[PDB]
């Protein structure tokens, strides 16, 4: 068995997206095919930032409801989608897991990891938020209603004085996810037919981030807070070559 290794990195400034692949080329001569294992790593930034403000009494605020990495071999290709990590959906604060030399570790607190229904061409993961507590008064999730409060999802105060734009609350004291972002690391097993004439292989890599508009308005006596859903979608794609025979994958 010969293992071929590689770290490949964009960042996409538009989208405020950093985008890591390590790769791994495993040849095992009893094995029927070549494999090659992508890692997907890097960070999609939150961006929970207050966008409008329409005098004292309306505010908006965008902030990141989901996260999604997907892989997608073009149709023509004969390489294949064999195996994905994590196989299935993540409730928990964490994700670790040990591959057979990885492991796997990412942090999506208020957040739950659903697994796209992988072909043999695509897989992909969405990162999408649960529910948070707001200063011990929660958990307040996406559907909160509340006939006077509306949706206290990110209402800092239901009484205070100040302004709008200034009753939003503190990234610090939210999800991680919501303003550092989103630290993606999962891994695709790809195999390919080692007697296939076209030795080569394209694949497309997609990082996205969903962004809600939750929005902050006077009721004449207190603040009432709205979301609505899926408001903004961020795209970044990007194609790698995949070499069997050199054992490369580039950019």
């Known amino acids: 068995t010969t293992v071929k290794t590689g770290d490949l990195v964009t960042y ?4 405020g997206m950093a985008k890591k692949v390590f790769y791994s080329f495993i040849d095992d001569k009893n094995h029927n095919k070549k494999l090659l294992v992508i890692r997907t790593k890097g960070t999609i930034a939150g961006q929970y930032r207050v966008y409008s403000e329409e ?4 505010s908006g605020l965008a902030w990141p409801s989901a996260f999604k990495v997907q892989l997608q071999l073009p149709d023509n290709e004969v390489a294949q989608i ?4 994590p196989r299935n959906s993540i409730d928990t604060k964490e994700y670790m897991s040990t591959l057979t030399g990885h492991t796997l570790k990412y942090v999506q607190p208020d957040f739950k990891t659903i697994l796209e229904s992988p072909t043999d061409k695509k897989v992909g993961w969405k990162v999408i938020f649960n529910n ?8 307040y999730d996406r559907d909160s209603w509340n006939p006077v409060y509306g949706n206290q999802l990110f209402m800092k105060t239901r009484n205070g004085s100040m302004k709008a734009a200034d009753n ?17 690391d999962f891994a695709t097993v790809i195999t390919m037919d080692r007697k296939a004439s076209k030795q080569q292989t394209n694949i497309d890599v997609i990082y996205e981030r969903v962004r809600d508009d ?22 970044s794609s990007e194609r790698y070559k995949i070499d069997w025979e050199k054992e490369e994958m580039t950019n």
């Not at 005098?55 to 309306?58: D, E, F, M, Q, V």
């Open 82 to 85: 064999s195996d994905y990590y």
């Open 55 to 58: 005098g004292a009494n309306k």
């Open 12 to 15: 996409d400034k538009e989208n």
């Open 214 to 235: 939750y929005q902050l308005h006077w009721t004449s006596t207190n603040w009432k807070g709205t979301n609505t859903k899926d408001k903004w979608t961020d795209r």
């Open 168 to 184: 939003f609350l503190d990234p610090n004291k939210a999800s991680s996810l919501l303003s550092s972002g989103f630290s993606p």
């Open 132 to 139: 948070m507590v707001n200063q011990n008064w929660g958990p």
